[PDB]
Design a protein around this nucleic acid. Structure first.
Ligand SMILES: [Zn+2]
Lengths: 119, 36, 20, 87, 114, 208
RNA sequence: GAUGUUGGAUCAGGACACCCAAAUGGUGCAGCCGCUAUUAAAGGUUCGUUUGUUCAACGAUUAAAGUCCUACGUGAUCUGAGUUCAGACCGGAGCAAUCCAGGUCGGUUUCUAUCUAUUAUAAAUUUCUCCCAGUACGAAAGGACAAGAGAAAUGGGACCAACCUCACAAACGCGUCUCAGAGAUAAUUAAUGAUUUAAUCUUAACCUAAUUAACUCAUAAUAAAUCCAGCCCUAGAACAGGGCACA
RNA sequence: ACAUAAUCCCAAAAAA
């Protein structure tokens, strides 16, 4: 049962890693995701933002991205193994203290001081 | 349409009996059709 | 609530012996 | 030959057998026609089921009664007495 | 989106930026369910005027493949289903284009798409 | 047409169209045909489908069970079930079988044991609203409230009341099969399946 | 030597004098929508503001926002808003003790179930949008039946792979998936050859063409007893169910 | 044309 689920994970990761060269990223990293999904005339949709939360599960492993657009906060969750995504580029790399960036919802300057502190 | 007494309204009205009930049928006008 | 009537011996025996 | 039974008058379609369950609105009406088209041996049996006195002996003597829609009688390999009283 | 939920107006020429004493509220949703979403028309109440508007934003996306907006925004319109405002602010979802072409006037007047 | 399977797990799949599909996996360990019982009045004949774990042989002891396995020349088996076959032309004698018996795109029905909830209240069973949690309401919150009417003394049979829920047989209908794996003996079924993983399930031909 | 009298909440069941959905007749029914009457209770019959309402007025929808009975259902389930009795005022009546089938405020609602009864198998139900179409018809305005397709909704039976509440590997919807033939009869109503009664007639007879829900299934869930000490379980009150390679 | 399951006491029958 469980080792068969591990086999599912292995098979999925093989299928994805062969076709997709997308590098490994972690929570609190500034990324740019290309998307061919929408119906817009331009096939390429570039979304720049920092990943607030990533919980890997099976083939359905997803990561949530967040950024400030035109004064309004925009949060879009993408599937890591989603074939709709063309590529992903890492503009910057951060760490913080946790895989949960939810504390950034308040956007306080003190927490930003800590944000700048660690590597 | 539905009454307890069925009589011919005009000369062209015809009385019939079907399924244990009496009915009035008139080809000239449909308003003369009655049911008991 | 309160019992409507006093329990007979038979019912008492059958209740306290067989099912337990 | 319980299916070859013949009821007089218009009672064929006009006879209603009532079957009610514990559930609300579980009242079921089965005409003699459809019942004959489905389970005919029930009809005559019901006609007997109201004739006998109540309580025990009713069911006791009810188990002594057997009906079939068509003729197949392995019990006729066992010799029995035949009584003929047609109406 | 449900009744009594306050929404923001992104229309510049419609429902003027100058605020009243009572903030805009949502009376009813055209959908058979009290919970409305993007693409659904809603009946909103403003002081002195009761109007109709589309929902261009939501704080609670159902699917994982859909973006999430921090604030709920609406676009005012008329019975014909067209914006009465000459300008629209803030990004707009790409679902509105999939719905109908008659409503694409909003999409065409929108600055950005996510 | 059908076989007995074992619930494995669930996982999303991505079609070339781009539409997401949530499916469950049904693993087939072993399958053997045991007994063939012909019938007349039912206008159909019964067959025996069996999925064994082979471990239970020693800790499960019975005369008829063991004698059945031994006389039929069948290896030790965990689960023995029956299946109704209407078509007499497709009926075969005792034979071992594989999970290749199923084809993708075919809608199937899944019969399994529903998750036992143990003893459950009037809520979560019949989905009653209950009483308010405020405004002077005293201990009525999760209570079912009134039941019958003053006219009829006794309560109607089949009345909805709190009790044991789950751990019973249920059949899900209209489940499409996206694909099958013969070598790994895995069945991809679109839908939901009754019961927890590793619980015995049943895949049968649906009605459409 | 007591059947606790309104309303609301909760939980329903039934009636048909049918509001809506269905099948029709007539229409001063072109069409679309209406009016009137017949058949039909399977399902559904909303969310708010004012006031205790039984009401009523008003707001926004909806296919509709039906009526009545069940001790004007339901207080050994709840509510005390009304009212059924200890106070504080206004107004009226009375010389006074005090009242009023009048109006304003406040006023503890007791019980551990003995018996009867009860502690589910299933097959669904409703709507919107699009396509033929803007054709026939009509001066113009206006303007389908059928067939096909895509979406929901209520609800039945479910599940945890993602999202969500998640401090173990669990339970949930706010998340996901599914929902199906068929046969026969309704009361209307529309017919074919045709008598009695040279005509006529759906009916008397008889072979026969077609018509809502209920009423039923081609069927899907079910049942191999006869050891089970002891150790475990996503199983569980006990029990039952499952799994552990006994001496 | 009234509101829990039917028939105006079972089942049926016929028209001294
Ligand atoms: Zn006439």
């Amino acid at each position: 049962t469980n080792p068969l689920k591990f086999q599912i994970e292995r098979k999925d990761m093989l299928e994805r890693r062969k076709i997709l060269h997308i590098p490994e990223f972690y929570v609190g990293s500034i990324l740019r995701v290309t998307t061919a999904d929408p119906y817009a005339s331009a096939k390429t949709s570039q979304f720049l933002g920092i990943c607030i939360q990533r919980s890997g599960s099976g083939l359905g492993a997803t990561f949530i991205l967040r950024n400030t657009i035109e004064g309004q906060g925009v949060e879009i969750c993408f599937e890591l193994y989603n074939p709709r995504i063309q590529e992903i580029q890492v503009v910057k790399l951060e760490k913080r203290l946790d895989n949960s960036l939810l504390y950034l919802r308040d956007a306080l300057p003190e927490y930003s001081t800590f944000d700048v502190n660690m590597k | 349409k539905t009454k307890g007494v069925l009589k011919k309204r005009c000369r062209d009205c015809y009385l019939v009996k079907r399924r244990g009930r009496w009915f009035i049928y008139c080809k000239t006008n449909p308003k003369h059709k009655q049911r008991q | 609530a309160a019992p409507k009537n006093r329990r007979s011996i038979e019912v008492n025996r059958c209740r306290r012996r067989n099912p337990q | 030959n319980t299916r070859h039974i013949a009821f007089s008058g218009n009672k064929w379609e006009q006879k209603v057998y009532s079957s009610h369950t514990g559930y609300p609105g579980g009242f079921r009406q089965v005409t003699a026609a459809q019942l004959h088209q489905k389970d005919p041996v029930a009809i005559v049996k019901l006609a007997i089921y109201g004739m006998l006195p109540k309580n025990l002996h009713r069911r006791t003597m009810m188990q002594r009664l057997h009906l079939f829609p068509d003729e197949d009688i392995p019990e006729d390999i066992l010799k029995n007495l035949v009584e003929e009283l047609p109406q | 989106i449900q009744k009594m939920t306050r929404v923001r107006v992104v229309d510049n020429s419609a429902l003027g930026t100058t605020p009243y004493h009572r903030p805009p509220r949502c009376i009813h949703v055209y959908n058979k369910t009290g919970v409305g979403k993007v693409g659904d028309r809603i009946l909103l109440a403003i002081r002195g005027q009761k109007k109709k508007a589309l929902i261009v934003g939501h704080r609670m996306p159902g699917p994982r493949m859909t973006p999430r907006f921090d604030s709920n925004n609406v676009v005012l319109l008329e019975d014909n289903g067209n914006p009465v405002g000459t300008r629209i602010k803030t990004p707009i979802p790409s679902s509105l284009r999939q719905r109908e072409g008659e409503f694409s006037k909003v999409l065409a007047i929108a600055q950005n798409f996510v | 047409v059908g076989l007995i399977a074992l619930k494995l797990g669930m996982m999303p799949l991505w079609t070339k169209d781009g539409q997401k599909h949530v499916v469950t996996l049904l693993q087939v360990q072993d399958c053997h045909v045991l007994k063939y019982t012909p019938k007349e009045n039912h206008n159909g004949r019964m067959a025996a489908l069996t999925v064994g774990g082979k471990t239970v042989s020693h800790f499960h002891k019975s005369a008829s069970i063991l004698e059945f396995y031994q006389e039929l020349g069948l290896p030790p088996k965990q689960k023995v079930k029956i299946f109704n076959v209407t078509e007499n032309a497709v009926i075969k004698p005792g034979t071992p079988l594989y999970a290749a018996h199923f084809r993708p795109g075919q809608y199937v029905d899944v019969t399994a044991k529903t998750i036992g909830k143990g003893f459950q209240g009037v809520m979560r069973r019949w989905g009653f609203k209950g009483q308010p949690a405020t405004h002077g309401q005293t201990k009525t919150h999760r209570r079912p409230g009134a039941i019958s009417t003053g006219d009829v003394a006794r309560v109607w049979p089949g009345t909805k009341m709190p009790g044991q829920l789950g751990n019973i047989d249920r059949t899900a209908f209209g489940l499409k099969v996206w694909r099958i794996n013969t070598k790994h003996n895995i069945i991809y079924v679109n839908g939901s399946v009754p019961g927890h993983k590793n619980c015995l399930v049943k895949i049968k031909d649906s009605k459409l």
